[PDB]
Design a protein around this ligand. Structure first.
Ligand SMILES: [Mg+2]
Ligand SMILES: [Mg+2]
Ligand SMILES: [Mg+2]
Lengths: 190, 287, 115, 136, 49, 144, 62
RNA sequence: GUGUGUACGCCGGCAGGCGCGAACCCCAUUCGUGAUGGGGAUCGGGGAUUAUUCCC
């Protein structure tokens, strides 16, 4: 048998173009699931959340702020609707769009901080792949959340546009601008 | 299901179902030209504000808004690839837009009055036809920035349609309905007048042979394409603004000047090795 | 071509109040101070108004009918417990003097406890 | 001759499900209702995981009825999945050859071990452990 | 509420109960109790164990 | 291959039964249906004009699944959460007068009869009618 | 300067002002048999792959 | 979460009176970026309980 997300999105055609992030994005045949709801314990041990499927990680990360705490079925419905909107607008596999958005939204170099009362001084450092994936997911979720706030537009629609813009690489998305600014700050003080 | 646009409400009705199955009402004034996509999932619309709006048939708010036009917009249509939109507005211009990128691809301005009837081609992407009240029908196509062929109609062009095979373009203005072939550019093959008022709308049957024309005179004419002569007529209570045909000829829908619209629904067997002997069938005589 | 569209009242004047024609009728007729959301709904139910249409598409006869039921609720079987019967009654409040006397008594009790 | 039937339990938090599997034509019912009528439907695929993993041909010869009681919605759904999977495995062990039970069991395990083995959650935290590492 | 009961009729104000907090009280049946605190909704009511 | 009520979708069966009761007629409708709200925790009257027919269909379905229920049981079934100002929310029961008149209207159609133990239950005529509506729902779903 | 990929051979320790950074030893995927010391932010373990925009900088340099 | 201490029937919008032996969640509906159908402070009128809380 073939396992398809939500019963309609295949995982065999999805491929990852970044060698570094291949071991930290769980979408392939062993991590293929019908739903992003498994009732697993992925925070029990360090590095274990790399084995969590990336759709479930996005679903967990969309349960904010506070007013959404503990409501996972609502978030599953939001993700399903966003994937449907992505497929309608673009016509490609929404899983590939999500993978591309996560690849593009991840910063490659950050800046470490040495700070006293007067001023804080600044140094450039590298970023591990796990933190890259975590920060990409966080930036995408934050961008969707801020886009949907106090606006006549469903959170699912804003999430779909955020993923589309991030996978496109356009600067219209929140995550791309944040990554570019962080990389510019890291570059400027090498 | 059929989408009926009326005043500021776009209503989606199912088969039978006198009450609308869905309603899009977020219009301050008189939405225009609701049209389905080839997948039946998205619909383009227009508004007197000037924005082109994409709607999901299960949502309540538009997915994409296009802000290029300055005045009211009356015609919108999809392309062969189900990802681009062609629009034309009352500021005498027609624009081509991209759906995922959410920006205008291209602009055309070659018309002198209200552009209020456009069509697109299923066979060839980027090939579309538009019509205005400046009596001309201009065909913008291919990959270029100027009209390749233009067509002159004697009266304001209410409707235009493209026949799929052979490239026959039918235009309806006043009483006249004119047929133009593309094998010879600007060739008026036939002009037909069988209505005694303005021909409002024109539709094509599921089979290519039948062609339907509705008009203000509360009568709908059915033509054969091979013969180009009348084959049937329909009579209605009010003037037909809109005419629509379902799959095959299952449902015929006409939308009127007034609120009401009319829907017109339609033991053991021989084995191979056995030798077959046929018995006579009894013939029945009349009384 | 001659196609005459239906007329739409952009503004309405009901009971010396300006009503916006672009609202739905149930919400639109709550601009009156006396009228709330429930009273609007019960009045429109009594005057058999379609609730899916804006205030602008209502005919003149429909508006006068709505005014007619709104002015005479008993004649059209609207119960008294639902009505806002505001009788002219503004009685003076004598609770302030009693509260001042109670405060004086409490001060006297505190003084007596001090002694 | 004698009737062939197996009854198995599935558990999740305070939710308990009892599943009976006998010879039949492929009917699966929960509390007298079909599988597709169980709410919430958002987790409906969670309730369909074993069949999709195994195919209709393996469920074609059995009838399964489930009675679930206690707990919440999600716990009840997980208990029903566990009961169905365990009931099918037990029926194939008892009345079908052991080999097919082996492939089906290994498939159910390699997808999700929760389908067959319940692991309840205990209290383990850093607070019980002393400060620092055990060594160095 | 089992041992605890709410008593009314002994006092007429919350100032009265405050003066007699901790006092020994009893029933006609002979069960012994103690005044604990004054309540709010009846003016003289109090809580006793 | 006999279709029962439990086989078909409950929400679709409720809509079908309500329309059947409205079309067939002979169902008594109280005069105050358009002036009342269904509970004290409701803020507005129901939007649907034919809430009584939907309530009657929903009440009959519950009696099929669990018979012997009375007015109080119907009140508890249709109860819900109540928000009260700056105070925390609490559970609130439904209106007894609405449920009682629904039960009396159902009894007039010879579908609901008094229970010997207490409350009300379904007539075998009513059980036949619900099974027939269940058969139509399943047949329509399979055809489409 | 072309982007480079590196593999983590040895995790050396926790450095930086507040201990937030990790000194590791990395070797290039090119067949140049080179190895340097880098600072990494975030949880990093053995076998990870790092993307270096500029591969000439050394973490411990005068 | 059993110390001898309410299920059901009728009437009424409700609050109740009269007799007798779960929220959250999920599907759909209306609204709409406007201090707005968000929020319910303050204020006016009416009704039940034995001055008191509740209901419109
Ligand atoms: Mg909802
Ligand atoms: Mg306000
Ligand atoms: Mg308000």
């Amino acid at each position: 048998p073939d396992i398809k997300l939500f019963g309609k999105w295949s995982t065999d055609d999805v491929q990852i173009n970044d060698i570094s992030l291949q071991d930290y994005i769980a979408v392939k045949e062993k991590y293929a699931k019908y739903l992003p709801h498994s009732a697993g314990r992925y925070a029990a041990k360090r590095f274990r959340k790399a084995q969590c499927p990336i759709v479930e990680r996005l679903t967990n990360s969309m349960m904010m702020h506070g007013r959404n705490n503990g409501k996972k079925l609502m978030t599953v419905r939001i993700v399903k609707h966003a994937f449907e909107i992505i497929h309608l607008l673009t016509g490609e596999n929404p899983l590939q769009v999500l993978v591309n958005a996560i690849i593009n939204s991840g910063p490659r170099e950050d800046s470490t901080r040495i700070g006293r009362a007067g001023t804080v001084r600044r140094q450039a450092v590298d970023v591990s792949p796990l933190r890259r994936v975590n920060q990409a997911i966080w930036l995408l979720c934050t961008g969707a959340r801020e886009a949907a706030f106090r606006n006549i537009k469903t959170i699912a629609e804003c999430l779909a546009d955020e993923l589309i813009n991030a996978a496109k690489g356009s600067s219209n998305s929140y995550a791309i601008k944040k990554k570019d600014e962080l990389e510019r700050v890291a570059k400027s003080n090498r | 299901n059929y989408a009926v646009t009326a005043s500021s409400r776009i209503h989606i009705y199912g088969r039978y179902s006198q009450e609308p199955i869905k309603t899009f009402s977020r219009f301050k004034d008189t939405a225009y030209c609701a049209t389905f996509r080839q997948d039946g999932r998205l619909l383009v619309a227009g508004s007197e504000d000037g924005g082109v709006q994409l709607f999901d048939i299960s949502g309540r708010a538009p997915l994409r808004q296009f802000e290029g036009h300055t005045k009211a917009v009356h015609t919108v249509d999809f392309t062969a690839d189900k990802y681009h939109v062609v629009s034309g507005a009352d500021d005498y211009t027609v624009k081509l837009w991209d759906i995922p990128n959410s920006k205008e691809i291209l602009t055309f301005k070659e018309h002198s009055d209200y552009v209020r009837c456009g069509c697109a081609s299923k066979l060839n992407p980027d090939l579309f036809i538009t019509g205005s009240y400046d009596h001309t029908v201009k065909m913008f196509d291919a990959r270029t920035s100027e009209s390749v062929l233009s067509v002159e109609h004697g009266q304001p062009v209410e409707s235009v349609l493209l026949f799929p095979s052979g490239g026959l373009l039918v235009s309806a203005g006043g009483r006249y309905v004119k047929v133009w072939d593309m094998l010879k550019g600007g060739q008026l093959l036939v002009s037909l007048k069988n209505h005694h008022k303005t021909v409002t709308c024109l539709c094509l049957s599921s089979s290519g042979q039948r062609l339907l024309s509705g008009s203000l005179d509360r009568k709908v004419k059915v033509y054969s394409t091979t013969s180009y002569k009348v084959v049937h007529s329909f009579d209605y209570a009010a003037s037909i603004l809109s005419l629509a045909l379902a799959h095959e000829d299952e449902t015929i829908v006409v939308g009127m000047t007034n609120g009401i619209l009319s829907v017109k629904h339609r033991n053991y067997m021989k084995q191979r090795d056995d030798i077959l002997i046929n018995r006579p069938a009894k013939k029945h005589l009349e009384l | 071509s001659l196609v005459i569209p239906e007329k739409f009242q952009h503004i309405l004047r009901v009971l010396n109040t300006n009503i916006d024609g672009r609202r739905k009728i149930a919400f639109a007729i709550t601009a009156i101070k006396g009228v709330g959301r429930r009273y609007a709904h019960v009045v429109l139910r009594k005057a058999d108004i379609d609730l899916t249409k804006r205030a602008g598409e209502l005919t003149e006869d429909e508006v006068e009918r709505v005014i007619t039921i709104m002015q005479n609720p008993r004649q059209y079987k609207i119960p008294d417990w639902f009505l806002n019967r505001q009788x002219x009654x503004x009685x003076x409040x004598x609770x302030x003097x009693x509260x001042x006397x109670x405060x004086x008594x409490x001060x006297x009790x505190x003084x007596x406890x001090x002694x | 001759g004698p009737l062939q039937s197996v009854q198995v339990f599935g558990r999740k938090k305070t939710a308990t499900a009892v599943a009976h599997c006998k010879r039949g034509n492929g009917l699966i019912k929960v509390n007298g209702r079909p599988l597709e009528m169980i709410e919430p439907r958002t987790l409906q695929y969670k309730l369909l995981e074993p069949v999709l993993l195994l195919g209709k041909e393996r469920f074609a010869g059995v009838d399964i009825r489930v009675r679930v009681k206690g707990g919440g919605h999600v716990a009840q759904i997980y208990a029903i999945r566990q009961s169905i999977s365990k009931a099918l495995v037990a029926y194939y062990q008892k009345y079908v050859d052991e080999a097919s039970k082996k492939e089906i069991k290994d498939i159910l395990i390699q997808y999700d071990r929760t389908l067959l083995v319940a692991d309840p959650r205990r209290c383990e935290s850093k607070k019980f452990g002393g400060p620092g590492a055990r060594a160095r | 509420f089992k041992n605890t009961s709410f008593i009314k009729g002994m006092f007429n104000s919350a100032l009265e109960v405050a003066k007699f907090e901790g006092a020994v009280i009893r029933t006609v049946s002979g069960i012994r109790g103690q005044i604990k605190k004054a309540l709010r909704a009846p003016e003289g009511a109090f809580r006793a164990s | 291959p006999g279709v029962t009520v439990k086989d078909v979708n409950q929400q679709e069966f409720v809509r079908a039964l309500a329309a059947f009761l409205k079309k067939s007629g002979k169902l008594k409708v109280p005069e105050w249906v358009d002036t009342v709200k269904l509970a004290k925790h409701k803020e507005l009257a129901p939007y649907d004009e034919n809430w009584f027919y939907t309530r009657a269909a929903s009440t009959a379905r519950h009696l099929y699944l669990r018979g012997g229920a009375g007015v109080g049981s119907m009140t508890k079934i249709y109860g819900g959460r109540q928000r009260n100002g700056v105070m925390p929310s609490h559970f609130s029961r439904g209106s007894k007068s609405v449920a009682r008149r629904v039960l009396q209207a159902l009894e007039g159609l010879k579908m609901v009869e008094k229970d010997q133990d207490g409350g009300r239950k379904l007539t075998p005529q009513g059980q036949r009618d619900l099974d027939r509506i269940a058969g139509q729902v399943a047949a329509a779903n399979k055809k489409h | 300067q072309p982007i480079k990929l590196a593999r983590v051979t040895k995790v050396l320790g926790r450095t930086g002002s507040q201990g937030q950074c990790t000194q590791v030893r990395v070797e290039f995927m090119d067949d140049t048999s080179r190895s340097i010391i880098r600072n990494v932010k975030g949880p990093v373990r053995e076998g990870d792959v790092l993307t270096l925009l500029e591969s000439e900088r050394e973490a411990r340099r005068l």
